[PDB]
Amino acid sequence: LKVILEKILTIPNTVSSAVVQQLLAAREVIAYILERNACLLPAYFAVTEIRKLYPEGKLPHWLLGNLVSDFVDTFRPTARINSICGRCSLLPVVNNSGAICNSWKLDPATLRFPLKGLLPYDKDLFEPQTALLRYVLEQPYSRDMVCNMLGLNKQHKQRCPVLEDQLVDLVVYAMERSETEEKFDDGGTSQLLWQHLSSQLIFFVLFQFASFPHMVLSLHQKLAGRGLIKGRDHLMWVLLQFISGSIQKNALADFLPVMKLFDLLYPEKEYIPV
């Protein structure tokens, strides 16, 4: 079955029809193989090999036709048996005691739940799970939890990009929140939020799981034209923590775009009073 399918894939997507009736013999062979009545082989093998060849989101060959597609649909019920209801909205409580359960782990490459088998699962299980780690990061003392669920081991440099993207999204969300009112309460759950945000970031960037120039360029791109300027002083405080933390370890260039950021985030011509 593997070799026949791989050989049929070599036919061009547009060919003549005077030969297609001579070309439908492979379709007849496959139709005999994929029949669950004669029981040539367990259907689990057939569906898993087809899914190994065709991942989800990719259309099958135009010669095979419905013969393949309907097949995987027949495995729709079993995939419902092995799915936990409301998996996406389950949220734990963050603690530093360790001993992580295997049910909270995520894919380091693309932030997906590890799924057993190649069954045609539900759609909601294939989108990235951005809410879970967004909630985890926001909680204080959530340091080992994030590295445990992302598979990080804090002994080898990795430079994980999705962590940088999530950190940038969290900083801009905090900036929007500080831009919202900041008038009902003097504190407004802001200064502690900025301190935590800043404190965790210092930990993530020190072990080089994220890159400073890339984060600054990404922040400038996200804030370019957004017009959220009410708590820019706090972001500059975070950048001061950035630069003063490791000025001696690295070169001056790593701090070049900060200049553009200062100009952009501070459009003025008149003097700033003390």
Place this chain on the structure above:
Amino acid sequence: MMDLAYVCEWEKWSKSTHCPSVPLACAWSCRNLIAFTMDLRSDDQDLTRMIHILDTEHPWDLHSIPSEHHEAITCLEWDQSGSRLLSADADGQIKCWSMADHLANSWESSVGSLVEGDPIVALSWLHNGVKLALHVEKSGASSFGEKFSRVKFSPSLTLFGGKPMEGWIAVTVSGLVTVSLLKPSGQVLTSTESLCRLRGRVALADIAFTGGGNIVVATADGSSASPVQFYKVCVSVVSEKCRIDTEILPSLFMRCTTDLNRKDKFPAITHLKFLARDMSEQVLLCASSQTSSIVECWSLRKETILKWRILSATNDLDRVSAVALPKLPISLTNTDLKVASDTQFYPGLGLALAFHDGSVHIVHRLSLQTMAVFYSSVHLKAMQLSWTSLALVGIDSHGKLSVLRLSPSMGHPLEVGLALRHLLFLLEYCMVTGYDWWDILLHVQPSMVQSLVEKLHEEYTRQTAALQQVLSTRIL
């Protein structure tokens, strides 16, 4: 003598099948360059989404630009100097095409703007702010400055002195307007805004400029029973982008509906035009039914403080398919009408109209009266005129292109001297500017070539020691 110059057709282009009709566009540049698009539907969709570039000196060879557009192209515009082309279609994708290696047979684009999902109904370049006025009475004044007088309009968005800024403005199907500006470098600044809180269908739109640096946008729903709204727009670059300030102007209502005799006819508006770009005080409307049509003109003259009134209205017209406007800037003063009427000098008093028959009409500007009728022996869908208005290009509902010779006399006999004076006055306009004179050469008779050459020779002389220094190559 209204005549036909030459008809150009292409083999294998016709005989299309299963092809719904699609509107077309045409554009004539300062140099004798034609940019258009034609309905082909021949074994490929992209043949209906190509830009055809034609040179009138060599009609037989045509250049095809394979534009990467996803929907039917709506409008085409040339720059003030014919070095760049603006093209737009449905689903955004406004492109700026630039000449490659200074070759007219190679084009490439690197500048564009995009709004997702909104077809563009209006598009225009920004104004530079220089125009001239031509006086036929002073055709023998023996002074270039005396003949063509500066009018001194003001330019829009002046930065760092008297140098204008370049860019474009577009109006979408909804109440949405986009503005783009070009930096001296490759940088481009884009912005979008909503016209007013009343969001509805804008089937037709038009854009004009006014003295002082203001834009007038006219929107028409197209139901012939709703008012046509007018808005004022100001563009200002506050140090990081172009902000748009909009406000409302008084509207009008359609005529030929309160006649209380037969109002059910003409239930849709099909054409809304400005009588001349940078002239926002006159608006032409054209409504049509399934059989007949009506064309009217309105103005905003001072007698509310501002009101729109009626100027002229034709008796009865067939279905209107194409309208074209003059480009020659006539002074339009009272003292010039008499001298342009006694002498057969009509280069800027004509509006060109086409119908669903083989009939093309030239109608007077101020009062809608017919003066020239042409029969082709099919109908014309898109057409344009020239700077000197000596000829018009036309695209029919086939693969044919037509070029028609328009004469100033329009059949009225004249003496040799008046024709020579007309031709030399028209040639001096192309002398002062950088425009070509192919349509002028279309009408010069072989008999009076020597007189024209010699009289132009003495016209070259006796200038104030400066015009001769910069016009030697052109005079040769």
Place this chain on the structure above:
Amino acid sequence: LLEGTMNLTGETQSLVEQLTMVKRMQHIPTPLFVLEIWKACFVGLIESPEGTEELKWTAFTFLKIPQVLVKLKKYSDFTEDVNCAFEFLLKLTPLLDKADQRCNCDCTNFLLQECGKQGLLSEASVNNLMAKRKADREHNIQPNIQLILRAEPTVTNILKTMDADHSKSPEGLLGVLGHMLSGKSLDLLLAAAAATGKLKSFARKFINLNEFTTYGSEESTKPASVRALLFDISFLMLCHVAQTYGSEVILSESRTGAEVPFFETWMQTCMPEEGKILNPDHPCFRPDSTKVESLVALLNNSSEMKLVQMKWHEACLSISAAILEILNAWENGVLAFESIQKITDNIKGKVCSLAVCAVAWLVAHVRMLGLDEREKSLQMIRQLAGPLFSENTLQFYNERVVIMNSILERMCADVLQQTATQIKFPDTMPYWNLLPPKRPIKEVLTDIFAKVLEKGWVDSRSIHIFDTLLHMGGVYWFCNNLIKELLKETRKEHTLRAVELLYSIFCLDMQQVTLVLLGHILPGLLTDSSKWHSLMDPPGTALAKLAVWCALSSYSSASTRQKKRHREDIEDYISLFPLDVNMRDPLNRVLANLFLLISSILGSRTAGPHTQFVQWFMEECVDCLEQSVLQFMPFTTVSELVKVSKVVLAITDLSLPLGRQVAAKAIAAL
């Protein structure tokens, strides 16, 4: 849900034929059909917001659908199918509990009794189902259900006895009008009439009474006040009916002679609705020049006091030019503010219709006026609609000022939105100005389509947004964007449910959308050399099923906005389809062109996915038909299909006189 949302006043024959057509198009068992109908009715009832919409939904779901079921019985064994559907429906306990707790009564019992009255369900089955429902449930203010079911006979009685004007007794007329002028009585009567489908005669009778009472005759002060009250109350009811149930019911659409009612002309030329904008300088706004001067003299002198005989129609036509003159003089600066206050007090003192007509004309004039000069009129407009005016009321002021405030709100909110103004006339318009003001429409269209696809059912707010998006964008843009969104699915269930939802979405105006589709989108996707890469098997089959459904449904042969839309624009279909029965109907031409194209594609060379698409189109075309759109099909494709590879022949032959021999030749050579 779509039928119950917008066109609740339409004739039930169209709904019945549409339901039967849908049932025939896709094989549906009867119990599933009835269960789906009941579940849709209940879920539409639950989500309705508080107000008149809840009353309308209750009236619809408890009055109109029994006649639909009765007509289904008549056209069509059905009894046990209804019982089986009911026993399916009774299993859903939380939905029934939510519906029960929303309406504060056991709606299941009332529904069972109502359907038993129609005779659809047997008495023993009704009793058993009632016992089952009570067992499941075991686990002073009258509800609106009982009010509707008990007030519909009152509607019938009032319609029956009002023709004789209660033996010409004006005092009894005032009594009965005041009785129905109490809390929510008018809305209940209107909803009952609309659900019963007898509102046309109701409006006709009120129009006749108004035409009788406007001219009037000589009377003393008390009967003159009676006449004025009758005129004002009739005007208020007609205006409320116009502003609530559209502009189709009051207009007769069948009137012989020049004796047209004046209120019809005022409706056509003086009230700004959602689909019409008025011209302030229309000839109807310039009746004369002496009547308006008499009216302005009466207004500026004192209270009118001449209402014994006043020619209400001519006076009402005259307030427009009068208030024009007062506003012009006031802007000239020769009149003080207190004079305007006195004039507004005189207008709002006794008769309230004059304020309504003046406000309507002021809105019509302001709409054209520019920004810098509009603010002058709005202050006198809100003075005309200020607080309630006391020490001048005859009687029955509460609901009169309430209905006047509602009418002026629904008439003036359109202009109030354009400027930054708020008057706070104290919801009655939850579906108004829903789309975001600045962002493009494609984003919201795609987001709403995705949400509807994910949820699995369409909401009424989504229906309204789809309607306004279709109005703004156009049929071609709407259909092209929706079809482009369809072709991004790789799963068969998702595209199946997408097509099922899109059929009902396109059911807004089937003729125009099917014409646009079959004339522009399918040929474009079928002719281009780079577009059949997206015509794969699941989306291709789903799109073919949708296309054949739409084509034959439109061949078998739905809003006022779309009515004016397709009456507005013309299209020369002869030029669009040169074509190489009647040959004037555009559907025939476009279907013949489509069949010619499909025959050419099938007979062409270098076949690919497009031939599979046309094979699927032909297969579902054969499957769906009962025996009919195959009359225009060419005779060569009968042999072509056999060449490219029974029952797919005999049905397609149509038993033509040429058909017999061509079919014999085709089937013989297999």
Place this chain on the structure above:
Amino acid sequence: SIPSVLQGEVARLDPKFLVNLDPSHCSNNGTVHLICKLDDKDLPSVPPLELSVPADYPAQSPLWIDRQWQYDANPFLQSVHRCMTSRLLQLPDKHSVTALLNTWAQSVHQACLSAA
């Protein structure tokens, strides 16, 4: 359409054969289908023996569509069929259609001679 080689070879065949286009199947393509009839005074009647001609007929060989049930239920016809199989196994590569038609005629003649 029909290549010139096939038209010429059909024009230059013995008048014992009147081969023509197959009423069924596709046409005007590289692959064509022909149905044959034999009109020989000295030989009996036999099945039509249709042929299929692929694209670019020169430098290749055509194929014969076997119809086993047609030639069965008669000793004479199956003797013809087995002689046919023998002769087509004896034919070399790159052969033409006229050679196959002559082989058909000669096989029919040999079977008739063997029968009587």
